[PDB]
Amino acid sequence: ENRRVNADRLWDSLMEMAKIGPGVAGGNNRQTLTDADGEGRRLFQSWCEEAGLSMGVDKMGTMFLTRPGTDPDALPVHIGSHLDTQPTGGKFDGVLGVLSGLEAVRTMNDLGIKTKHPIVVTNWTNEEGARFAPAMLASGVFAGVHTLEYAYARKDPEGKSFGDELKRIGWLGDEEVGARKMHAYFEYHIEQGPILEAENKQIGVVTHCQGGWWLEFTLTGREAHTGSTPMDMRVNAGLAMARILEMVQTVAMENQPGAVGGVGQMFFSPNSRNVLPGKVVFTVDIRSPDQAKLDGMRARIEAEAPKICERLGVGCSIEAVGHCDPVTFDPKLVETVRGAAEKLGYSHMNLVSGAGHDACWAAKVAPTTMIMCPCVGGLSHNEAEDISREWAAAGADVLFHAVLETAEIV
Amino acid sequence: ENRRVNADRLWDSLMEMAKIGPGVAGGNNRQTLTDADGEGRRLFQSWCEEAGLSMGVDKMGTMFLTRPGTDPDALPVHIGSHLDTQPTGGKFDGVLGVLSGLEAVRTMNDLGIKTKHPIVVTNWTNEEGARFAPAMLASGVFAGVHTLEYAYARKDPEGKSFGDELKRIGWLGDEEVGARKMHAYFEYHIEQGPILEAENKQIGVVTHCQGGWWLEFTLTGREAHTGSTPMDMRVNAGLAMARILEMVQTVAMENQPGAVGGVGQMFFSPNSRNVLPGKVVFTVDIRSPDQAKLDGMRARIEAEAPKICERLGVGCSIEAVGHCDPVTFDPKLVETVRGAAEKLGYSHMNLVSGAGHDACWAAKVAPTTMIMCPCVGGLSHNEAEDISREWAAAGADVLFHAVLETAEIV
Ligand SMILES: NC(=O)N[C@@H](Cc1ccc(O)cc1)C(=O)O
Ligand SMILES: NC(=O)N[C@@H](Cc1ccc(O)cc1)C(=O)O
Ligand SMILES: [Cl-]
Ligand SMILES: [Zn+2]
Ligand SMILES: [Zn+2]
Ligand SMILES: [Zn+2]
Ligand SMILES: [Zn+2]
């Protein structure tokens, strides 16, 4: 209640990691299994070892940095997030949670605090799902949602497989994925939504996570000349994609509040200015806090889209390339978080997470919750993503205390 | 009337060139200024020199192969097309006209025919405008529509410039672009439309070319998280693009008959599945045989599209990256072509060309017309583009006789 993390030390570690794999506007382009990700993992590794943590790496490249407890038989409390970013990443999505875990350890060392349960700072591979789909791939293997082989065979847009890239940057570890058992899992993360800033609250007590689908459409047209083909003879997969995006906007807007839909990825083949496309590939991202509502939006998109296509002579094929159902966080750990906020005198409210997180898969296999701090305009997945020294430190303080309650001081 | 070209020799030259830069389905991917194009140009060069033609090359890489006439004062009759293809090219778009020119020369040699006017077989650089926009770039320089510098600075999607690529494959010539004066220019080309096949006509007597615009849209959104951004806070340039494609389909359909509108090329940035795009870039291709109608479709697309975008918070920027006005071919050469068809006993009808061609720029600077043969289902810019030995030869015969009438036998 007096005991606080070092704000300047946390902040300084965030500005140092921001320099690894810079974007073009003061954010980060440090995507999974690139060289810059390798550099980021090594920097994090070295900081952690100077803090007395010992490293284990699983076959999905997930890094576990351990601070032993006083009971050698006791299961660990993990503090988790990701160091991998979007191509237009901010400095804080993922990174905040991992380096807050480090700061909590450093503070314990500064105060010579021992715990019953070990504490394990965790960096999951390919949270973002920008380079290889799905998102939360490593934590999904951990929870048994995906096989190792399935994960290894994911390809980026240049055709490189996840497995090979992991091996290339040198982070294929020896531990079986998901062989570690957790006593509890905590994730500190920026909100990525406008609510905490708009309501003037310092801490978000995360109760639930909204679920989502990634539906990948492959539409088949007929390559043909854009100048000499009569309109009544075109098989236009581009127009079909256009009508499908409009229909997604309608489904989302007919399902307010608590529903989003949209598309961020799109490919045309062969992508010539005077050739109607033979393939159009894109991903629809739909999400709701409410399972039945999410099921209903999916069924509907999947029924209406083939009819848009059939009206145009266009072939339509859909694959789920990502899926997380809504999650309810562990009520006991939710109280610990609220309690830590109150003990510390920090304004707080409950919150549903808008994004998915590795925490959502962690909750399959262990008591789990999350903590959020505010971010400016709820902007995230943009280089302009912004938090203050003061916001970051507040939530880290809450993380510190929640973890100590759960790991048990001696 | 007895004198016909060698159908097996023409056809065999088409099947030989088809083996250079193969596609993935028995067409061709032999785009401008690739190594495959270098190889195609060299094969054509060697066939022409075996036929006693002498070569000049301009600074745009256009190849002029000359057969002398007996009048020292007389300007040449050119036979023109292109050997460069789309990524999903057929074996016949462009190639038919260039190798028919060669076949006509070989037949003149076989019959020992001399002409008053010299004959110049012409292969123009970057007709297709698939790799570098605009289309008909070299012939455009020739007719004075584009500067040499502007042409050299065109970039492909990987950032290579036209100028450098021309130099690399070894086709930068020494002649000033457009220094040659032509007496007349003829282009034999497949129809790329269904009409000749459907009407059971062997020869298309081309009277006009429909004109067109390439309008390149750059839409500006805000990169944002596709799960955690509320719908009322998204600036969705993808949805804006979707509504613009639908508006184009409406403008085209409301301008029937004689209007086409469509999109073959599209880029999203940064093209991650969970990041709404910051940039969406695409090209709208609009065409009409009627100038006022084409003008009107452009004004309308250019007025309605910024309003679609402004309603979504999206910034809108439009640049013309290609333009040819409707062309009326030289009526005297049109009669020569009709006459050759009649002399030979080939069924014929008039046609407006759906595509643009180098012929359209040639017509700025010399009497010009085109000859078409049928193609199956009017399918073109597709590897499955199809003509028969019999169709190809008939139109070449008409080319031969039209050119002889115009160049004048001795
Ligand atoms: N904070 C963050 O990196 N989160 C990702 C993870 C995710 C993506 C798709 C999905 O279906 C479930 C989770 C995001 O929601 O974009
Ligand atoms: N041979 C061929 O396929 N021709 C091209 C040329 C063209 C392109 C754009 C334009 O505005 C005018 C002409 C096509 O029609 O796409
Ligand atoms: Cl090449
Ligand atoms: Zn995250
Ligand atoms: Zn993220
Ligand atoms: Zn052509
Ligand atoms: Zn073409």
PDB file of C-alpha atoms and ligand atoms in Angstrom, chain A residues 225-227 274, chain B residues 82 86 93 127-128 135-136 189 192 212-214 285 287 322-324 354-357 381, ligand 2:
ATOM      1  CA  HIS A 225     -10.326  -7.779 -70.278  1.00  0.00           C
ATOM      2  CA  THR A 226     -11.727  -4.747 -68.413  1.00  0.00           C
ATOM      3  CA  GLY A 227     -12.175  -2.721 -71.614  1.00  0.00           C
ATOM      4  CA  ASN A 274      -6.972  -4.146 -67.070  1.00  0.00           C
TER       5      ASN A 274
ATOM      6  CA  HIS B  82       3.247  -5.776 -79.237  1.00  0.00           C
ATOM      7  CA  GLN B  86      -0.405  -9.520 -69.245  1.00  0.00           C
ATOM      8  CA  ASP B  93      -2.956 -10.697 -77.802  1.00  0.00           C
ATOM      9  CA  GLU B 127       1.533  -1.870 -74.745  1.00  0.00           C
ATOM     10  CA  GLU B 128      -0.282  -3.736 -71.990  1.00  0.00           C
ATOM     11  CA  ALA B 135      -0.672   1.364 -71.263  1.00  0.00           C
ATOM     12  CA  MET B 136       0.564   2.072 -74.835  1.00  0.00           C
ATOM     13  CA  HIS B 189      -5.310  -8.003 -83.587  1.00  0.00           C
ATOM     14  CA  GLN B 192     -11.095  -9.616 -77.576  1.00  0.00           C
ATOM     15  CA  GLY B 212     -11.069   5.140 -71.760  1.00  0.00           C
ATOM     16  CA  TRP B 213      -9.780   6.488 -68.450  1.00  0.00           C
ATOM     17  CA  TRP B 214      -7.701   4.853 -65.740  1.00  0.00           C
ATOM     18  CA  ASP B 285     -11.206   1.578 -65.775  1.00  0.00           C
ATOM     19  CA  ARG B 287     -14.694   3.254 -71.332  1.00  0.00           C
ATOM     20  CA  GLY B 322      -4.002   6.598 -68.286  1.00  0.00           C
ATOM     21  CA  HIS B 323      -6.232   8.072 -70.944  1.00  0.00           C
ATOM     22  CA  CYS B 324      -7.090   7.546 -74.621  1.00  0.00           C
ATOM     23  CA  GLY B 354     -13.295  -2.568 -77.246  1.00  0.00           C
ATOM     24  CA  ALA B 355      -9.641  -2.486 -76.167  1.00  0.00           C
ATOM     25  CA  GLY B 356      -7.109   0.263 -76.711  1.00  0.00           C
ATOM     26  CA  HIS B 357      -4.135  -0.435 -78.969  1.00  0.00           C
ATOM     27  CA  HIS B 381      -6.436 -11.276 -70.758  1.00  0.00           C
TER      28      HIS B 381
HETATM   29  N1  LIG C   2      -4.151  -4.928 -76.165  1.00  0.00           N
HETATM   30  C1  LIG C   2      -4.741  -4.530 -75.030  1.00  0.00           C
HETATM   31  O1  LIG C   2      -5.181  -5.438 -74.294  1.00  0.00           O
HETATM   32  N2  LIG C   2      -4.899  -3.182 -74.789  1.00  0.00           N
HETATM   33  C2  LIG C   2      -4.950  -2.385 -73.502  1.00  0.00           C
HETATM   34  C3  LIG C   2      -4.592  -0.886 -73.740  1.00  0.00           C
HETATM   35  C4  LIG C   2      -5.278   0.264 -72.987  1.00  0.00           C
HETATM   36  C5  LIG C   2      -5.354   0.350 -71.603  1.00  0.00           C
HETATM   37  C6  LIG C   2      -5.912   1.458 -70.962  1.00  0.00           C
HETATM   38  C7  LIG C   2      -6.389   2.544 -71.678  1.00  0.00           C
HETATM   39  O2  LIG C   2      -6.954   3.608 -71.030  1.00  0.00           O
HETATM   40  C8  LIG C   2      -6.304   2.506 -73.053  1.00  0.00           C
HETATM   41  C9  LIG C   2      -5.737   1.394 -73.676  1.00  0.00           C
HETATM   42  C10 LIG C   2      -6.291  -2.470 -72.737  1.00  0.00           C
HETATM   43  O3  LIG C   2      -7.345  -2.216 -73.360  1.00  0.00           O
HETATM   44  O4  LIG C   2      -6.238  -2.753 -71.534  1.00  0.00           O
END
